[PDB]
Design a binder for these strands. Structure first.
Ligand SMILES: [Zn+2]
Ligand SMILES: [Zn+2]
Length: 139
RNA sequence: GGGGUAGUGAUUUUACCCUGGAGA
């Protein structure tokens, strides 16, 4: 008997918006840091966010995944702490998100979820703030 | 410029639409 459902964290490795899928690079599996990082499939239907769903390369994610015949596959994908994903830089309203949950219809003062860790304004990482964002720097 | 929409489940960055004497 061995695990069928696992928690993972990492970043979006790439995503094709038109096709609606891509891969995550998993940097931690069940709380264990991995080297090298491993690819986990992600389909648009599993993205936790409001409206047309996407990811951008480099955004911070957590997810639940399983092993399917084709390979590791995400079952649901969120930002850190279970908040909404960011999406493509072309996403309508995507530049005006609640600081706390990433939602599109309110601001942090009105947020109905409890205070979350501070996420980078550009990539949602909880390990840096935007003044030190390497994703923003190589963009 | 400004606004909006969506969809191919396996390997790399998306296809469209609306908008002209006025834009919260
Ligand atoms: Zn919120
Ligand atoms: Zn960042």
């Amino acid at each position: 008997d061995e695990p069928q459902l696992l928690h993972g964290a990492g970043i979006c490795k790439w995503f094709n918006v038109r096709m609606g899928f891509g891969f995550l690079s998993m940097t931690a599996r069940a709380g264990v840091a991995l080297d090298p990082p491993v690819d986990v499939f992600v389909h648009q239907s599993k993205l936790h966010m409001e409206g047309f769903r996407s990811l951008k390369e480099g955004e911070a994610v957590e997810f639940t995944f399983k092993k399917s015949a084709k390979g590791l596959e995400s079952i649901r994908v969120t930002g850190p702490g279970g908040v909404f994903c960011i999406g493509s830089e072309r996403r309508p309203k995507g530049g005006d998100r609640c600081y706390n949950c990433g939602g599109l219809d309110h601001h942090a003062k009105e947020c109905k979820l409890p205070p979350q860790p501070k996420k980078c304004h550009f990539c949602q990482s909880i390990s840096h703030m935007v003044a030190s964002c390497p994703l923003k720097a190589q963009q």
